């Protein structure tokens, strides 16, 4: 009888930076996808390995809701087999991804006149992220032969950068709130079912 708490994910006041993306496990609830259907603000709403129409007629062991904020032209990196600074260093989906990606423009919430410097992304990393891996380290990146010893300098760079979202940016550079729903079928029983399989 319990409904899945999609509202507290999609309609949260504050969203995580992509490098420190937020994950909420959704279990033991009825997945009413109608609220997701009827939100006419979604620029992106697509699924992989499953049709978004058949979500109310399916059951899963767990549904993982990952959320973060990136630029508009970076939303496409939140997809199987994609590359770029966000997919390589911040949030990586697997090539076998089963789930849905939802993104909507959030210029009205996450932009500030003079810049909102609270949203960050990782720019440097010695290796790409594994799927669903998170790196929240703040260690100086050694871009040259000389070791850094934690001191920023020549070929020694801080790994995070700030978006600095302003409302006057073009839509490509404007902030977009992203929610990735992952569909897991590992250890029975299934706990998240649509109202049509319930």
């Amino acid at each position, epitope marked *: 009888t319990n409904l899945c708490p999609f509202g507290e994910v999609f309609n949260a006041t504050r969203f995580a930076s992509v490098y420190a993306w937020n994950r909420k496990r959704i279990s033991n609830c009825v997945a009413d996808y109608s609220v997701l*259907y009827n939100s006419a603000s*979604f*620029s*992106t*709403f*697509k*699924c*992989y*390995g*499953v*049709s*978004p*129409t058949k979500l109310n007629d399916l059951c899963f062991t767990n549904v993982y809701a990952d959320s973060f904020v990136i630029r*508009g*032209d970076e*939303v*496409r990196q939140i*997809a*199987p*087999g*994609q590359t770029g600074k966000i997919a390589d260093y911040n949030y990586k989906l697997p*090539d*076998d*991804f089963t789930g849905c990606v939802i*993104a909507w423009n959030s210029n009205n919430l996450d932009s500030k006149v003079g810049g909102n410097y609270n949203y960050l992304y990782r720019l440097f990393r010695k290796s790409n992220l594994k799927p669903f891996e998170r790196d929240i380290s703040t260690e100086i990146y050694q871009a040259g032969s000389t070791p850094c010893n934690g001191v920023e300098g020549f070929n020694c760079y801080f790994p995070l950068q700030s978006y600095g979202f302003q409302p006057t940016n073009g*839509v490509g550079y404007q902030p*977009y709130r992203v929610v990735v729903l992952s569909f897991e079928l590992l250890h029975a029983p299934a706990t998240v079912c649509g109202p049509k399989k319930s």
Partner: nanobody, 127 residues
């Protein structure tokens, strides 16, 4: 990024039909998803119709009964048949492409789903 060229635009009477064509250059549309977008004078860019690499489709509500998107990977071409054209359909129509190695299934289709864009072709429906 990839090179995209549109064709089939023009001026047509209301109720008439047009067939937009998106031709890739320098690659094949096999792994790619293709979408059609339009921007009317004095308005924002809107998604019209999209097709996945698995041939699943998206249609905006305003074109649902009138437009049909199709894929021909052998001829390396995506078509947008546009029947029963109305004056509100007057806009510049853009083709868009995005790698889609797995099969994507759309509920909506927006500009945030594509990285490559064509120059566009003009569609005008006036009597």
């Amino acid at each position: 990024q990839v090179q995209l060229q549109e064709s089939g635009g023009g001026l047509v009477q209301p109720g008439g039909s047009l067939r937009l064509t998106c031709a890739p250059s320098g690659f094949t549309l096999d792994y790619y998803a293709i979408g059609w977008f339009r921007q009317a004078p004095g308005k924002e860019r809107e998604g019209v119709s999209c097709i996945s690499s698995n041939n699943s489709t998206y249609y905006a509500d305003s074109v649902k009964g009138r437009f049909t998107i199709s894929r021909d990977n052998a001829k390396n071409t995506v078509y947008l048949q546009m029947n029963s054209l109305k004056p509100e359909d007057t806009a510049v129509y853009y083709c868009a492409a995005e790698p889609d190695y797995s099969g994507v299934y759309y509920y909506t289709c927006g500009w945030t789903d594509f990285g490559s864009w064509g120059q566009g072709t003009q569609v005008t429906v006036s009597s």
